[model samples]
Target: SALKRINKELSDLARDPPAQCRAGPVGDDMFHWQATIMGPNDSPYQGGVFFLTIHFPTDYPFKPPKVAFTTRIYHPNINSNGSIKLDILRSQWSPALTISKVLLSICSLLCDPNPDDPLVPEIARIYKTDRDKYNRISREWTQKYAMSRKESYSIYVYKVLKQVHPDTGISSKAMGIMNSFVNDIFERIAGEASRLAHYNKRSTITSREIQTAVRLLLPGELAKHAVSEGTKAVTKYTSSAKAKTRSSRAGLQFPVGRVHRLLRKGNYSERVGAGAPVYLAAVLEYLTAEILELAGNAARDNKKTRIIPRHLQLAIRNDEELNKLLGRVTI
Candidate 1:
């Protein structure tokens, strides 16, 4: 009976999703599904669109769905690969954890990534040392992978390129033009703005939220840029933080100069009271500048609508915070 009820609820959701959430099944694979969550305000992960995957158990409500992220993400409790670490999914899980409760708990998880018990040690370390930086990286990932809808076109173009153009072998000079053409086409199709004008219509977007919006709004070049910078920074910052001691002769140190060792050894031991990563602030700065114009516009429009900046700011901020925590993005 309970299983039937769960199935019915899931079906209803599939037929008519609520205003904010979007989800669907994995075709023939009924057990696996995905969802998109719009962020709430006043939180660190505002203005972002987070994604999650739900793997229903054979036993249904007897066990919680093993939910994880499918996007390239940055979070303390979710691995860069998008795996989440929530206690309720594991040991703390109770029979009473309903679908509503479970999903809501996931919503809460976005606002507060549990660095004290991390899925990615480096992200967790960054979360501690620099909350802002971690937020930025996470926001960027959401934008690039989740927000933008450019992939459909990007994929088509890439496919066309790989097909050799059937004539000039995609000529060098022509290839350059093609690249520029792609950019122009993307701009024409997606708009000149890095983020949608009304997406985060309240608060000033943080560097992190800016990055996420870019990934969504400018999927090809922008998404690539965000991913490269974010991933490189995460690796560098995480590896450096994990080093126990620095060596003198420029020889090396543990995780600092030992990414291989850390990976091979699986000893990412940065566990306790350390702060957030220091270096990612640079990337965040660049991201913030790119999206500042869009955020300002959103705020201005809200003002015209007679909404106070503080109220809209809180609303947008909460959206970003919740989305960032939950791994929100664009598309």
Candidate 2:
């Protein structure tokens, strides 16, 4: 009965997903699913995509689904650890309630917080007394915790440091110092290299300009070391590039049949274009390659021999360009 009811709800969700709410199975398990709730546009939580993990018990709708926010949100009803203070998950639950309905309530709850039934009284006190102050704090919290993209490439510094230092500890301050120096050096080199290129009435920037930049920026033996290392890197990359082209020529990792099947769903009038699947396959393969390339960097940074979902997730999230392509997608 539980499986049957959940199955019905799954189809029902596809039929009509609620406003600002998306819920479905995260994996193969029917009972365990995940949901997404876009924060109410009018509220302090605006522009946030909150994640909710859901679990349906064997007893079905009679027993409420265990629902909790995996996304950290600031509200009286929602605590620091993403726990929601909602009666629907417990005493007030009913079989009539679908996930769409429940998710809608949570989405609504983001806007209309119930300070009267406080989960975090500290926040509730501010909400009850000074609405403006509470709103500002809530907004700040959302930006700090929920805002997309970390500003600096500092984490990679720590990653490499950890690999070198082994058991040694590094402070955030230390990392920031390293990050600023790295950024400054790169910025200067780029600026100088561009100037060098434009001087000779050349529109293109080449390795010669970079070598000139390095010579101009670095001192004595340091410049020599940089040049030798740069040369070594160029050769290594060129060799690897050759190998990559060979391996990559082995045809599409994913077959065209699935792409054709999906293409047919788009309402083709006469015939599904034969050339379409090949083009689609190529595009998909290119996307996979980009993702794999980023994931490899992530795995190296994380000092892992094997690439896992974490590597892909971190890599995708880190790249600003890739973020726009697969922003809502989870690993």
Candidate 3:
């Protein structure tokens, strides 16, 4: 099963992380991992440290883990939103494959991207038709996002907040506070999502599981928008990949006008930045743990193996903090 195999593989990874690549469980969640790949020397991706999120499937090596870039990369096989279109992870998976092998293969891909079989055709066209321009833009993106040797938590947070609300005057102190809060929330959510997957006897954390987590974690309008945005994000990349589609747009520009209008109509006084939806996406990540915790307590009290909405309601009702978070809304 994936449990024993994943545990063994995790141990092996910790003992000997591959050169220029490393992966491990994100906190206590053994199935979900945050991985890194240092850019290969003399390549356009050089000096960059790319991050990836890996979700192992329930069927162990028989099904390859879902791997996607968390950090933006300029590559033909990697999309603008970081979704990857690799053959091995899709139809070519074998039982003998392991995380280490996957990470190494990713490294090789960075060294020599398969432009002929590209995820981003424009990037591929540039790679084939204009090598110099391709290398230049690739290096530029590498420096802009991934050049830092250590995690620039504060810088990253500040940039995201600014992107969401460029006009708002934020203090350094506020940036620091928000940075800590966001990081804390995201880690907690990752752990919670892992637990949710486990509850379903699944090794992989699907987008639907994440949506459920968001619904449990946030209250009222916040949860609604978060789930909507999160679903859109997951579906967008997936469908785009299936269709082999490529757009001329440069970066993470979503069709969020409708969502923004809805937020405004809801009487949200604070004008959301262009990237405000991301905050909701982050909150959605942690809701699974909160919902599961409450539901577990409810089930135990009722002496039942299966959890029902009534159990969740009782759990939410008992928690003063959740009551405050939920406000007057009923889920």
lDDT tens readout by residue for model 1, 53-167: 6777877777767877654556677765567778888888876775556666767777776778877778777889987887777667667655512212223333333332222
Residue-pair clashes per candidate, as listed? Answer: 47, 0, 4
Tens digits of lDDT, candidate 2, 1-331:
9999999998888887788887767323578676777778899888766666688999988899988865577789988666888988888999999888888888778889889999999889999999999888878877775651222544444444444444434445434433443434444454465456435634334456656776666555545665655444334433554445321222434344544443343221112443334333333334444455566566777776455556666766897755654555533
Report the number of backbone clashes for model 3. 4
Error of 1 at 122 (Å): 1.7
lDDT of each: 0.45, 0.61, 0.61
TM-score of 1: 0.40
Higher-TM-score candidate of 1 and 3: 3
Which stretches of candidate 1 lie above 4 Å from their native place? Answer: 1-5, 11-20, 148-331
lDDT of 2: 0.61
Per-residue lDDT over 1-331 for candidate 3, one digit per residue giving the tens place of the 0 to 100 score: 7888998997888788899996766554566776778899978998988877788878877888999886778998999666888778988888788889988888889888899999888999999999999999999999997850211244443344345434333345433433344434454544455456546545345555556666776657657766665655554544454444221011223223333343333222112333333333434323433444455556666666445446656766787765655435443
Candidate 3: C-alpha lDDT: 0.61
Candidate 2 is scored at a TM of 0.48
